[PDB]
Design a protein around this ligand. Structure first.
Ligand SMILES: NC(=O)c1ccc[n+]([C@@H]2O[C@H](COP(=O)([O-])OP(=O)(O)OC[C@H]3O[C@@H](n4cnc5c(N)ncnc54)[C@H](O)[C@@H]3O)[C@@H](O)[C@H]2O)c1
Ligand SMILES: NC(=O)c1ccc[n+]([C@@H]2O[C@H](COP(=O)([O-])OP(=O)(O)OC[C@H]3O[C@@H](n4cnc5c(N)ncnc54)[C@H](O)[C@@H]3O)[C@@H](O)[C@H]2O)c1
Ligand SMILES: [Cl-]
Ligand SMILES: [Cl-]
Lengths: 354, 354
């Protein structure tokens, strides 16, 4: 009835609009409009299932044809093998193209695979997202990227597929581990470097954000989503800025074998590097770099570069992406650029690092 | 230089236009414009490879980064297993999202899997079709359907993906088995039931078509493609008519385990059934039905219903598609309709059949 909620209309230029709902309580009924008289398959992992599945099923339980596919927890399971489980469940239970809906209940991993499945099953069926991690709330909810991993590369197979609705709740943070939360906070901070307005907003509401004030967190999520929506709306060209800090981030994950820092933790460290590298190239002053890194730390995000990564391998990891060597660099808050830079510059910059 | 060719612009409403090139000679250079300075992977099966691969590679051979993936011949190989071979080849050889092109050199099976691979590899890369069968020339070249089979269902996983160009040659018929050719001719005839103009054209050029006059065959292919292009342009709603005779067709294939009649042969028999069923329902007169079936036979297509299919299983095969029981029925040449019909009607109609 009278519970703080927030809706944000996202309107893809090549698809019908949908809205991202962010609420203070956990009330899965906000999605019944897209689940009625439909064959529903919920995809989750063991953990999210343990915590939310029986509550979710209970929020429907209206004699509706509902099935579940519980994948294993982990990035390794965003695989073809898991995709086949989702696809067999759909085929074994004769889920038609017309009244089928996949519901992705979980974090980014579940969101990617479920979205991809929905994109290919009979060349596309309704897809509903329920991001249960901060990172997936502010990053998966907009853009339409869906994908799965291959032994030879992560996120190499996928599709652009929009959801019918995105329902999420700040209540999910009550069960989300501190590291996972902070990892997602790195994505939020990224939007602050993209948008000067957001930067000022976060800087003013830090106290409430850290104290987890419901009204504030809801708006924080909403504004992050608006920024990504506005960036993709520019079409994919100047959209590259969303990769601020990912070049260094992806390389950290590759060097640790994706068993060190979480994805979001790597982005945090990566942004700190893009900043320092931006200064090295003379794009920002030392003061600006100190201020920017301070800001990341300001929100509990760690910017320390992992001790177990060698310079040799780290440099090699960044060159694999002959082609040209492009980075997302900062010139000012709200001013990021896709910038081509030599291997020498990169190598010389990493010497200060060791 | 001076060789009869035919281009037909197809303009998908949700994608850039492309054109279907149909020529009298085999000259693969008509595609160099979409292969220059690109990493090229050619997908084919053992047979098409045997006959055309070394000619194809020789038509490029300009120090270009070209690779091949030779799948096994057969519908059974339009599988995830084959899709993985195409995907590993792309990843092992570091084919980027930006200068990659998949070339589907073969018939419909190769066209579907290659198109699907191109649709998902890094969420979409350039796709080029070289249909080597009559059926794939007039059916795969328009519409954008790509798919792969699953043990639990044929063409259940796929994507809508348009090509950059479609190059084909009537020269391919010189190596194409009579049955395969005739099977493709069933698809051409289908367009005659869809379009009264085409019907009249085929009826006038039968002699030349059967005698394989180059100028005539080229136009036949061109006009078939125009019809499908015009049908999909109506958007997917009234587009169902393209399934004229497929309801019965798919059922024949299911009963024979896809080891009896070829796909196109089944469509031929299927159309003959849709016609007889249309008469049974009182939509067309007996004379019309006799005329329509005569016309199919007119082009060397067989309309005999397979002797090895039991009524029991055949009826069961058609009900699997509770939902409603819809057929594409004829009311006149150029007048097909998606028509809902009872199980009783269907069963009663099949009694005349045995
Ligand atoms: N396609 C996109 O737009 C996009 C954008 C960003 C990230 N991603 C993808 O997202 C993935 C990582 O995202 P992520 O940070 O959600 O990681 P994740 O999906 O692996 O989730 C991390 C962990 O948190 C658990 N978890 C999730 N929600 C929880 C909750 N409410 N309470 C307790 N535990 C919970 C999961 O079981 C898992 O162990 C990456 O694979 C990345 O490729 C996709
Ligand atoms: N997506 C679409 O728009 C669409 C439309 C119609 C059919 N299809 C698909 O196409 C498939 C069947 O099409 P098809 O009739 O091309 O069958 P096919 O692709 O299996 O080819 C039939 C046989 O002909 C051989 N062959 C092909 N070209 C040849 C040539 N020039 N000379 C000698 N041999 C040759 C092949 O090796 C194969 O044995 C079905 O799986 C169907 O799903 C797709
Ligand atoms: Cl970067
Ligand atoms: Cl039919």
């Amino acid at each position: 009835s009278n519970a703080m909620i927030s809706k944000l209309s996202v309107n893809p230029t090549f698809s019908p609009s949908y809205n991202i709902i962010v609420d203070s309580v956990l009330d899965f009924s906000h999605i019944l409009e897209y689940v009625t008289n439909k064959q529903v398959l919920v995809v989750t992992n063991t953990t999210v299932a343990k915590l939310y599945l029986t509550k979710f099923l209970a929020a429907l339980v209206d004699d509706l044809d509902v099935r579940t596919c519980i994948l294993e927890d982990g990035e390794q399971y965003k695989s073809q093998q898991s995709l086949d489980k989702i696809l067999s469940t759909l085929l074994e239970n004769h889920f038609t193209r017309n009244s089928t809906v996949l519901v992705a209940l979980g974090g980014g991993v579940i969101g990617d695979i479920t979205g991809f499945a929905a994109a290919i099953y009979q060349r596309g069926i309704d897809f509903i997202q329920i991001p249960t991690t901060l990172l997936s709330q502010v990053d998966s909810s907009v853009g339409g990227k869906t994908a799965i991993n291959h032994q030879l590369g992560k996120n190499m197979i996928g599709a652009f597929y929009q959801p019918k609705v995105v329902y999420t709740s700040i209540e999910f943070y009550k069960t989300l581990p501190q590291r996972e939360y902070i990892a997602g906070m790195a994505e939020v901070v990224k939007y602050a470097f993209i948008s000067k307005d957001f930067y000022l907003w976060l800087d003013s509401n830090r106290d409430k954000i850290l104290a987890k004030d419901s009204v504030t967190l809801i708006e924080m999520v909403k504004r992050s989503c608006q920024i990504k929506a506005q960036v993709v709306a520019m079409d994919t060209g100047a959209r590259a800025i969303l990769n601020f800090g990912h070049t260094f981030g992806h390389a950290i994950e590759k060097c640790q074998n994706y068993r060190g820092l979480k994805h979001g933790e790597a982005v945090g460290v990566g942004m700190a590097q893009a900043i320092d590298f931006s200064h090295y190239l003379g794009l920002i002053s030392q003061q600006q770099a100190k201020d920017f890194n301070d800001f990341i730390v300001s929100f509990g995000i760690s910017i320390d570069f992992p001790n177990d990564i060698c310079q040799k391998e780290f440099l090699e990891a960044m060159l694999l992406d002959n082609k040209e060597l492009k980075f997302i660099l900062i010139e000012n808050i709200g001013s990021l650029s896709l910038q081509k830079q030599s291997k020498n510059e990169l190598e010389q910059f990493l010497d200060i690092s060791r």
